[PDB]
């Protein structure tokens, strides 16, 4: 009898970590840091709803394709949701110049107020009612974009238009107009009389004469004529003036840009649910508590940072071992309120006391290391949505390589960070047990025999209140030096 042992925590845990060196390493304690679940709904972003375009495209909405619903309330949004291939775009076929630029402008803007600038009834000298087509049904009748006017010759006359709007607002105004490209020369004259026409737009920034390009094209949504649209931002206290002799698709309404800020155009097939999140992805929303996720790269909100991994587990405690007598043979499930500690084995004692001056010293710098790790990726790359047209493949690929590029880097970074100070979290625990041992050996010197198992046997009488002298770093050799002085010469001369 008369012993003392130095050992470490063990427990029911089966949590597993990885390092550079080893795969699958059972530990006492560890934190998962990778979110891999989503709710598969689309939700508001911290109280603020998305604009859900339904089966409509941004052009359908902005121009007022009769099939799309205007948002009369002038709502603010958190993001914009567009199906992958919407069905309500340019119902009248044609092009929409710098369309993807306009889409990118939407991503920095959060609220529109639709404003009349040219009332549909103020073109006394032209027909403002015949401009409808079988390509734009509203309740089955022929119709047309609601926010622009197909101007057409009145009484076989087309008096040359010159008309100005002064932006007397505080806000930028987004204005859209268009031009008509007919099938053939008979169709031009039947609509706008004057055989040779133009649409001229002027601001302080933009100067543009535009000309009808007559060709013979396939029937899209039923027609061969096309309609090409343009757009501009009119700054405050600037004016715009349109002049045309035919083919001019006039704006009636402009869009006040009333709130700029963080927004997004998310391609998703889902629809709205009564639900709120801090983080939305196109295939559902995230419980943004953990620092990394792998659900989707195009997540918006206050989000965890995206890494392409299947698991990412931080180690925080010991490995896990029976495990009898001392630290060399494993850890003690019998220690509970501490990570490293002791075992009495006394004239009176049993054992299992924890050294908390190095146990909370350990839970100190690892829970301080833990969030230090989370915060140094505070600045990690978040991807941003963008679109490109069939003649901008190179930049679309440039953009794609850049975003895959950074995700790969940051995925490597995140993994190598966990793998590495996982190996140093464990290498610390070992070093912490090994140093507990040396602080008791450096006090109990002559008066004890090193058992080689991580325990010591005492050449003296110990006493319970003297084995806190060793736990407290207080044990004085002299006060029982003279009792050990004699007993050991008895072993050298025992049996």
């Amino acid at each position: 009898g008369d012993r003392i042992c130095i050992g470490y925590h063990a427990n029911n845990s089966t949590t597993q970590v990885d390092t550079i060196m080893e795969k699958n390493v059972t530990v006492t304690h560890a934190q998962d840091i990778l979110e891999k679940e989503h709710n598969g709904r689309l939700c508001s972003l911290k109280g603020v709803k998305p604009l859900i375009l339904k089966n409509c495209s941004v052009a359908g909405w902005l121009l007022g394709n009769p099939m799309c619903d205007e948002f009369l309330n002038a709502p603010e949004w958190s993001y914009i949701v567009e199906k992958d291939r919407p069905s309500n775009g340019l119902c009248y076929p044609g092009t929409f110049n710098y369309y993807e630029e306009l889409k990118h402008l939407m991503s920095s803007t959060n609220q529109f107020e639709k404003i009349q600038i040219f009332p549909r009834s103020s073109w006394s000298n032209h027909d403002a009612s015949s401009g409808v087509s079988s390509a734009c049904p509203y309740n089955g009748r022929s119709s047309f974009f609601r926010n622009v006017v197909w101007l057409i010759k009145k009484n076989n006359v087309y008096r040359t238009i010159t008309r100005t709007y002064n932006n007397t607002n505080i806000e930028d105004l987004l204005i859209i107009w268009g031009i008509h490209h007919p099938n053939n020369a008979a169709e031009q004259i039947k609509l706008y009389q004057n055989p040779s026409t133009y649409v001229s737009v002027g601001t302080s920034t933009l100067n543009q004469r535009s000309i009808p390009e007559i060709a013979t094209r396939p029937k899209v949504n039923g027609l061969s004529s096309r309609m090409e649209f343009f757009w501009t931002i009119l700054r405050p206290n600037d004016s715009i003036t349109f002049e045309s002799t035919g083919n001019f698709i006039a704006p009636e309404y402009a869009y006040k840009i009333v709130k700029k800020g963080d927004s997004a155009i998310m391609k998703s097939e889902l629809s709205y649910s009564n639900c709120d999140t801090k983080c939305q992805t196109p295939v559902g929303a995230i419980n943004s508590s953990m620092p990394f996720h792998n659900v989707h790269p195009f997540a918006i909100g206050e989000c965890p940072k995206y890494v392409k991994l299947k698991k990412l587990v931080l180690a925080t405690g010991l490995r896990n071992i029976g495990a009898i007598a001392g630290f060399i043979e494993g850890g003690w499930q019998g220690m509970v309120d501490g990570w490293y500690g002791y075992h009495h084995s006394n004239e009176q004692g049993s054992g299992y006391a924890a050294d908390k001056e190095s146990t909370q010293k350990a839970v100190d710098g690892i829970t301080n290391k833990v969030n230090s790790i989370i915060s140094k990726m505070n600045s990690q790359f978040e991807a941003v949505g963008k679109e490109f047209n069939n003649l901008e493949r190179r930049i679309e690929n440039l953009n794609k390589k850049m975003e895959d590029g950074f995700i790969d880097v940051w995925t490597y970074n995140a993994e190598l960070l966990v793998l590495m100070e996982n190996e140093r979290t464990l290498d610390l625990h070992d070093s912490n047990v090994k140093n507990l041992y040396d602080k008791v050996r450096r006090q109990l010197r002559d008066n004890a025999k090193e058992l080689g198992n991580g325990c010591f046997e005492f050449y003296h009488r110990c006493d319970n209140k003297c084995m806190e002298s060793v736990r407290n770093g207080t044990y004085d050799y002299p006060q029982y030096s003279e009792e050990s002085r004699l007993k050991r010469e008895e072993i050298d001369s025992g049996l």
Copy 2:
């Protein structure tokens, strides 16, 4: 007599590694991981040949510059090889609209099938034979692009063309046409009669009237007129219709895009050899066995990852030391089938036994660390070739900075990874010898004296079959405790 020593491997190796701390550190074993050789040929890519354009540019090929050879067989390719400045481009001078976009389309496509769409003999109302020029010799005669037709007024008449092709194929069709820009008004009328002409193209996606731009320009390849070309992808079950009153350079043949996939347009001056590779660079092919190379950034195939370094050597074993008696003084060339081990020195023995329960435990986690390192760069940036025209410098520089950017990052990553767990591979070996020592000391306790050289001398009789008791972690103190009990009191009372 009566000793035992603990030591490590040493060998004839002169291989050298680096760490954060030290340069040039001789080791027993190490793996080079950086490929720096190439064969200077161009080869097929795993059975599949490159399309070698010879002295021709992609436009020369596609349009059929009489100097370039068509590929009648409709072959599939692995990559496309274009000299840096080809000599057979637009032999008739002019421009080729969105040329670099078309080049980028080639990089995702692997096979064309040339298809007639408008046979050269089906333009009854126009001259299809006079359209040749002295800028396009074939065997010294005047000639012209073979895949397009220079249509010219027949009998001083130019009846207005309107002609349609319906893509009744499964595949995308690449179609090329062009327009003619003459020197002066006399030259327009002499060719196409009608003084004012146009070329109109329509699909469901594209609408384009095109107009002859007459100017007075320098003589390129001998002429002052120019010819401007356009192109489009016609989707399946879509049609295209061309309408023109003059200056129209008609397509005869279209290109079926019959195989899309991984391809590339490699600028290289070399020519084909009878040779095959897993990895091709513009200056030669790579023996793609090692994980990194530094031959060229624009390598394609299954390739090692590119880093801008001159050397990259992983450490896998001990440093390398004579080195007499114990581990404190160096390692033992006399140990051979193991990294760490022992030395007998017995009543009967000599020495040199290896501790394999920690020697393959070491070759375990380092050859497991080795390929763990290679695989975490599985996702490292591979560069992709792109071209830009003289008015897209900014993006070309954007693209260049991005690709240099990522290479710099991944070069830093690769180096810091080797340097760092090189220092921990060695720091492991030290720790492994130092722990072998402690497992024999923790068993042979009283019955041996620590010599300070990494050896122990026995206060008892050892026995060969008891010095595997120490190698096996089986040595019991008691079975010869009583013999050492006495001998040591004899030293304290010896001479």
Copy 3:
């Protein structure tokens, strides 16, 4: 009496470092590596001055806006300085085609030589003197760009211009011309007679007919007409020919590109001072001695690498502790010419000798580790300035994300590098003290008692010239083995 202790340096230092584990860790020695000061001036770059555009924009300079001063001396520059919103741009309002491309060309070019190509007095058949406007005052009179000529009908005639310049120079020539867009058809005819006009330019590379676009626009700087400018680089031994029937704004002077190289267009509000630097940022210049700075991302010259941090401090020495008797209790302010060492305590001695064979061995591999760290970021991303127009937002954001992207990566890299081998610099010092201790224990074996405080007491007579035997690794056990042999049996049998 009769002792010896092993300990480490301590000092007056209060310098603090960080690691992954701990914040704020006092040390003996450390190097700051982050520059955070600037002088707030703009200076020459290693003898070579900037071109300071003052209240002028690159277009104002190049075209010769009467308000901007030509640089008659043909100076070379190091960078170009442009205010954020200059006030002297196109004084005559209009556009400048591919303006941002031209700005990007300036960044690779270092010297212009202005060259006459078409003297203002060589247009016999047109008025070369009436082309001035109230939008371009020089000393209050009406004036105009000095490097281009507003050509106007002479005597109600406008003879069709055709005029050629052959670039007979070694250098690329930058040439600028323009076209005039009038208010209305009355204004066209009053200036250039011929109602329908064009401006045609031809080189071997460029073919361009250009047409006046008459519209009704707001009054910018007082006018509603606009003027649109173009530009091209004419290669050596190529020619350019302009042909026009009206509205043609002719070049008089071209710019020889006489020196290409490293340059930049820095947006800054400051002005020149008599001052020189190796590194300039828009808000001032940097003392480019340290390896990192955080002053500004758009710094040019030989510069430290930019990281977004507030501090970055390398550890190079010990932590800092009284600290009495041995290494377990702290370090000794009394050791001065060394990091680790000893303390005599002798029949004659006092103490405090330094072990320099492991002290310069330590200052060796850390000052070798220090600059190894600085050099592995030799290849770190340096940002490059670029501009984009209101219809290139997507790429501007692409460009912005790329440059923020790399800065974030390299900022993470730099921090994780310091934090990590700070922890291994300190973990080395500990290991170095702990190994000093073992080399004296492995020699003084039986003849000394381990005190547990990092000191040993001698069972023998020591001698000053024998306690360099322990510092030199020379101490032989035998020469005083027999004196200790006896004394220790006296302790076991003392009182």
